[PDB]
Write an enzyme that holds these catalytic residues in place. Structure first.
Site, PDB file in Angstrom:
ATOM      1  N   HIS A 174      34.338  40.425  23.257  1.00 18.71           N
ATOM      2  CA  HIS A 174      34.759  41.009  24.530  1.00 18.71           C
ATOM      3  C   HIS A 174      33.593  41.829  25.073  1.00 18.71           C
ATOM      4  O   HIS A 174      33.484  43.026  24.798  1.00 18.71           O
ATOM      5  CB  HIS A 174      36.013  41.855  24.357  1.00 18.71           C
ATOM      6  N   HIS A 232      31.693  42.635  28.752  1.00 22.04           N
ATOM      7  CA  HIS A 232      31.590  42.519  30.198  1.00 22.04           C
ATOM      8  C   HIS A 232      30.130  42.710  30.588  1.00 22.04           C
ATOM      9  O   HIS A 232      29.591  43.815  30.467  1.00 22.04           O
ATOM     10  CB  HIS A 232      32.477  43.547  30.898  1.00 22.04           C
ATOM     11  N   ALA A 242      36.082  44.248  36.527  1.00 19.59           N
ATOM     12  CA  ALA A 242      37.488  44.106  36.161  1.00 19.59           C
ATOM     13  C   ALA A 242      37.669  43.151  34.986  1.00 19.59           C
ATOM     14  O   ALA A 242      38.329  43.486  33.998  1.00 19.59           O
ATOM     15  CB  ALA A 242      38.297  43.633  37.369  1.00 19.59           C
ATOM     16  N   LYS A 281      38.800  32.521  30.028  1.00 16.09           N
ATOM     17  CA  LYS A 281      39.474  33.811  30.076  1.00 16.09           C
ATOM     18  C   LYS A 281      40.579  33.797  31.124  1.00 16.09           C
ATOM     19  O   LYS A 281      40.359  33.389  32.263  1.00 16.09           O
ATOM     20  CB  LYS A 281      38.473  34.928  30.374  1.00 16.09           C
ATOM     21  N   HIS A 306      42.689  36.367  32.874  1.00 15.54           N
ATOM     22  CA  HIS A 306      42.927  37.776  33.141  1.00 15.54           C
ATOM     23  C   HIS A 306      44.049  37.960  34.154  1.00 15.54           C
ATOM     24  O   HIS A 306      44.270  37.121  35.031  1.00 15.54           O
ATOM     25  CB  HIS A 306      41.658  38.461  33.641  1.00 15.54           C
ATOM     26  N   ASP A 362      44.491  40.178  36.612  1.00 15.68           N
ATOM     27  CA  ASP A 362      44.162  40.467  38.004  1.00 15.68           C
ATOM     28  C   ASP A 362      43.886  39.207  38.813  1.00 15.68           C
ATOM     29  O   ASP A 362      44.015  39.237  40.042  1.00 15.68           O
ATOM     30  CB  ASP A 362      42.964  41.414  38.086  1.00 15.68           C
ATOM     31  N   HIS A 404      44.426  37.561  28.826  1.00 18.12           N
ATOM     32  CA  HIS A 404      44.729  38.943  29.188  1.00 18.12           C
ATOM     33  C   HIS A 404      46.086  38.886  29.884  1.00 18.12           C
ATOM     34  O   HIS A 404      46.175  38.653  31.090  1.00 18.12           O
ATOM     35  CB  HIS A 404      43.643  39.538  30.082  1.00 18.12           C
ATOM     36  N   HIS A 412      42.898  42.461  23.344  1.00 21.28           N
ATOM     37  CA  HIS A 412      43.531  43.779  23.248  1.00 21.28           C
ATOM     38  C   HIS A 412      45.037  43.653  23.024  1.00 21.28           C
ATOM     39  O   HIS A 412      45.857  44.059  23.846  1.00 21.28           O
ATOM     40  CB  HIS A 412      43.230  44.647  24.472  1.00 21.28           C
ATOM     41  N   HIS A 472      41.820  52.751  38.385  1.00 22.46           N
ATOM     42  CA  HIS A 472      42.814  52.093  39.219  1.00 22.46           C
ATOM     43  C   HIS A 472      43.230  52.931  40.421  1.00 22.46           C
ATOM     44  O   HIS A 472      44.192  52.569  41.107  1.00 22.46           O
ATOM     45  CB  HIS A 472      44.045  51.730  38.386  1.00 22.46           C
ATOM     46  N   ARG A 478      52.263  52.234  29.707  1.00 15.05           N
ATOM     47  CA  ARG A 478      51.059  51.605  29.171  1.00 15.05           C
ATOM     48  C   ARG A 478      50.538  52.333  27.935  1.00 15.05           C
ATOM     49  O   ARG A 478      50.409  51.734  26.864  1.00 15.05           O
ATOM     50  CB  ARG A 478      49.975  51.541  30.250  1.00 15.05           C
ATOM     51  N   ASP A 486      35.119  45.286  24.429  1.00 10.60           N
ATOM     52  CA  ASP A 486      35.402  45.351  25.866  1.00 10.60           C
ATOM     53  C   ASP A 486      34.438  46.327  26.545  1.00 10.60           C
ATOM     54  O   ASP A 486      34.833  47.349  27.111  1.00 10.60           O
ATOM     55  CB  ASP A 486      36.864  45.733  26.133  1.00 10.60           C
ATOM     56  N   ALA A 536      34.399  48.258  30.119  1.00 15.07           N
ATOM     57  CA  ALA A 536      35.674  47.821  30.674  1.00 15.07           C
ATOM     58  C   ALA A 536      36.814  48.522  29.954  1.00 15.07           C
ATOM     59  O   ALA A 536      37.751  47.892  29.458  1.00 15.07           O
ATOM     60  CB  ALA A 536      35.820  46.306  30.588  1.00 15.07           C
TER      61      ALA A 536
HETATM   62 NI    NI Z   1      41.294  42.578  29.244  1.00 16.25          NI
HETATM   63 NI    NI Z   2      37.737  42.940  29.174  1.00 12.62          NI
HETATM   64  O   LIG Z   3      39.597  43.544  28.944  1.00 10.54           O
END
Ligand code: NI
Ligand code: NI
Ligand SMILES: [O-]
Lengths: 100, 122, 570
Positions: free
Chosen positions: C137, C139, C170, C220, C222, C224, C249, C275, C323, C339, C363, C366
């Site tokens: 992971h 970014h 993101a 991946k 994700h 979003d 994700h 995660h 966010h 969360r 990650d 991120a």
């Molecule tokens: Ni993620």
């Molecule tokens: Ni990530």
């Molecule tokens: O992530």
């Protein structure tokens, strides 16, 4: 100014040393990197003053006592060696078990 | 409960080097002037000329000292040393260029040794 | 003659029965066995054994089994075990595990480890040698993070992103063929093994397959971008047709369906979970049940590991910041409560301890710090050993089992998951040469020497103006293996089989060694080493409690932990 990369590199040692001096003056127990910074900066400053290599080695072992640092740090450092410009050229100063 | 990182807690016992091999002891004397350092695994017939000992026995043997350690010989100083076999294939090449082959043909090694003036040949 | 244990250990290294402590922690590794023979130890230096006519051979040329590099008296610690031996690499490939030296004068030398004139010697006496860590992971947001990754013995970064972009921040994706080709071209300058993951969303097979045929190494999914079940189905179809791994994700808003809908969408296939604990994202709150399926490979991000008395506040603040959450709206407060849930983290501590979660990642940038994956892994290991006590498999008062299980979480298990097992991930013959040498007192803080492809690439080295290398200030510097055109030879860029066969490297002008990803859709949770337990994970929807085997899992956060301010400047 005309600086070779060596001086630019030792300036980081000086910065770490002054940060460590501030931390120690506040009242905290030092950990390994800044203790090394203090010892090597004292060595460099003493060399700039005009002391010999033997006396620098001798006084390098009585700058930090073992209760000014973190628990178990005295075992981190077997020795510390540094490059210093004595009045007759650059030399290497090595001090063994500086903290005890 | 003092904390030390990387500290070891070794067990009880002893480590023996060169297990299950014959052990010999010889007398070595230095007749030269400059001091002589001798390594552990270096073969013991190709040693310096000025060394004086029973060169005949020191064929196909090495010093029974811990690896990396060395023996020192001052001028005019003699001492007893311990030797053991050289295991494996028992072929040796190079060094002082006296054997350049097997160790079972001691006649050639001794002939070359007394031809080139190696001291201690018998 | 008789040799005392202490002197032998000091001059050569620990032997059978010796225990070594990893940094300031309370963990001791005991050497199970040893391959070298006493009295025939090989060391270099003036007057040492490795010389012409001595334990170094001087007749054979390069072809006749003569090595190219050997680490002497190293202490290998891998999932295969912990033992002291000598490492021999040739042509950048690990070729020999055993003892190195001339068989002419030594006994019991492995036939393939002959040392000759064309060899290099590195003395790893009293140093811990581990395989290069694998990161899954990453970014790609900053090109100076490769040095931070290298400083922790990480040799494989597997992720996406094109820099400080919105989507790159993101998610870890490389959308489209153009962007992925640009990233592959820019990969030449990074001195690290790299794998690129493409976007795994869409409503048709062809757009998704176009990325795999362009040189992607995985996919991946994700939230979003939209984790609809149709997208999951399309990505899975493309994956098992192309034999590549898929990272998920999972949705956090449940806007498109609950967890069971995604579980049915995958339909019992093999997927990799990002995660899985859920702080970074996932189905609130019962995402963690994915850790129990026998066909889902779990993972974890670092910032939640381990459980201290400061995680909750910082996590809440970063969720506030990234966010754009506000305190004049209670929906944001509800999101934060749903969360960041401490009971689940306290459970994840034990599940990492119990081998439920098989891997561990970062990650980077991120909500996760790149340069402390091994650091936080070993911190979690020590905290769990302190709290839950010794495991059931411990013998003779040693922590071999725990060390193996926790070191499998960032070296070999991700390699199994990503399908890159047959080149990297462990110290084993036939694998690439990516080794990390640590000092025992610095294990888990700063890598002493990182070697990639047989050439030392990174080192904690001192001032360049001194006559000797030690004098202060010692800092992490890239060695000769990351300069000039040598970077093209010590690095491996992983690439899909289909896109490799299409001559993509030739079209792009790739110069690094090209790696093939294979044997990826045939594995599951039953193949991970020491972390192959599957069971039922119960998440209470209201009380947020975690029950495993009819027992509640929780732990108390600690105030002080090792691997900490004692080492770092700040
Ligand atoms: Ni993620
Ligand atoms: Ni990530
Ligand atoms: O992530």
């Amino acid at each position: 100014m005309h600086l070779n990369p060596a001086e630019k590199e030792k300036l980081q040692i000086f910065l770490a040393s002054e940060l460590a001096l501030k931390r120690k003056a506040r009242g905290l127990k030092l950990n390994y990197p800044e203790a090394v910074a203090i010892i090597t900066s004292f060595i460099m400053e003493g060399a700039r003053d005009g002391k010999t290599v033997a006396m620098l080695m001798e006084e390098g072992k009585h700058v930090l006592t073992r209760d000014d640092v973190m628990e178990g740090v005295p075992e981190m450092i077997d020795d510390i060696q540094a490059e210093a410009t004595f009045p007759d050229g650059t030399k290497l100063v090595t001090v063994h078990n500086p903290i005890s | 409960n003092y904390i030390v990182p990387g500290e070891y807690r070794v067990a009880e016992g002893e480590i023996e080097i060169n297990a299950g091999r014959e052990k010999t002891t010889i007398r070595v004397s230095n007749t030269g002037d400059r001091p002589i350092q001798v390594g552990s695994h270096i073969h013991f017939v190709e040693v310096n000329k000025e060394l004086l000992f029973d060169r005949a026995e020191g064929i196909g043997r090495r010093l029974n000292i811990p690896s990396g350690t060395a023996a020192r010989f001052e001028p005019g100083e003699e001492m007893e040393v311990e030797l053991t076999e050289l295991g494996g294939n028992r072929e040796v090449f190079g060094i002082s260029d006296l054997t350049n082959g097997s160790v079972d043909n001691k006649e050639l090694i001794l002939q070359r040794a007394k031809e080139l003036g190696y001291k201690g040949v018998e | 003659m008789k040799i005392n244990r202490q002197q032998y250990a000091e001059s050569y290294g620990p032997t059978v029965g010796d225990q070594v402590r990893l940094a300031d922690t309370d963990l001791w590794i005991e050497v199970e066995k040893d391959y070298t023979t006493y009295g025939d130890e090989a060391n270099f230096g003036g007057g040492k054994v490795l010389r012409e006519g001595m334990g170094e051979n001087g007749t054979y040329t390069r072809t006749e089994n003569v090595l190219d590099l050997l680490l002497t008296n190293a202490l290998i610690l891998d999932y295969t075990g912990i033992y002291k031996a000598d490492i021999g690499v040739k042509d950048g490939y690990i070729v020999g595990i055993g003892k190195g030296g001339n068989p002419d004068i030594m006994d019991g030398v492995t036939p393939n480890m002959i040392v000759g004139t064309a060899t290099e010697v590195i003395a790893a006496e009293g140093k811990i040698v581990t395989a290069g860590g694998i990161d899954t992971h990453v970014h790609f947001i900053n090109p100076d993070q490769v040095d931070v990754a290298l400083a922790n013995g990480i040799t494989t970064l597997f992720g996406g992103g094109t820099g400080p972009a919105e989507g790159s921040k993101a998610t870890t994706v490389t959308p489209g063929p153009w962007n992925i080709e640009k990233m592959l071209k820019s990969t030449e300058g990074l001195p690290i093994n790299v794998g690129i993951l493409g976007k795994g969303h869409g409503s048709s097979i062809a757009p998704i397959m176009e990325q795999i045929d362009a040189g992607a190494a995985g996919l991946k999914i994700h939230e979003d971008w939209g984790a609809t079940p149709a997208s999951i189905d399309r990505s899975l179809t493309v994956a098992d047709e192309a034999d590549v791994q898929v990272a998920i994700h999972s949705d956090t808003l449940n806007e498109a369906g609950f967890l069971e809908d995604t579980l049915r969408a995958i339909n019992g296939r093999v997927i990799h979970s990002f995660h899985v604990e859920g702080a970074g994202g996932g189905h609130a709150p019962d995402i963690m049940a994915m850790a129990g399926h026998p066909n889902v490979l779990p993972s974890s991000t670092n910032p939640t590991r381990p459980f201290t008395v400061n995680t909750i506040d910082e996590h809440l603040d970063m969720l506030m910041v990234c966010h754009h959450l506000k305190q004049n709206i209670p929906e944001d407060v509800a999101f934060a409560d749903s969360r960041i849930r401490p009971e689940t983290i306290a459970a994840e501590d034990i599940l990492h301890d119990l081998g439920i979660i098989s891997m561990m990642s970062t990650d980077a940038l991120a909500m996760g710090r790149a340069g402390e994956m091994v650091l936080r892994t070993w911190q979690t290991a020590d905290k769990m050993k302190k709290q839950r006590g010794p495991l059931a498999e411990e013998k003779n008062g040693s922590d071999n089992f725990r060390a193996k299980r926790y070191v499998s979480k960032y070296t070999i298990n991700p390699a199994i998951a990503q399908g890159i097992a047959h080149e990297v991930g462990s110290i084993e013959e036939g694998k690439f040469a990516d080794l990390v040498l640590w000092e025992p007192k610095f294990f888990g803080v700063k890598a002493d020497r990182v070697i990639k492809g047989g050439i030392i690439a990174y080192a904690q080295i001192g001032d360049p103006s001194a006559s000797i290398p030690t004098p202060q200030p010692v800092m992490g510097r890239r060695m000769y293996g990351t300069v000039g055109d040598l970077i093209h030879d010590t690095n491996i860029t992983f690439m899909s089989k289909s896109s490799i066969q299409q001559g993509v490297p030739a079209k792009l002008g790739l110069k690094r060694r090209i790696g093939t990803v294979k044997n990826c859709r045939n594995i599951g949770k039953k193949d991970m080493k020491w972390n192959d337990v599957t069971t039922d994970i119960d998440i209470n929807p209201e009380t947020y409690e975690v029950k495993v085997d009819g027992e509640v899992l929780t732990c108390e956060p600690v105030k002080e932990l090792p691997m900490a301010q004692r080492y770092f400047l700040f």
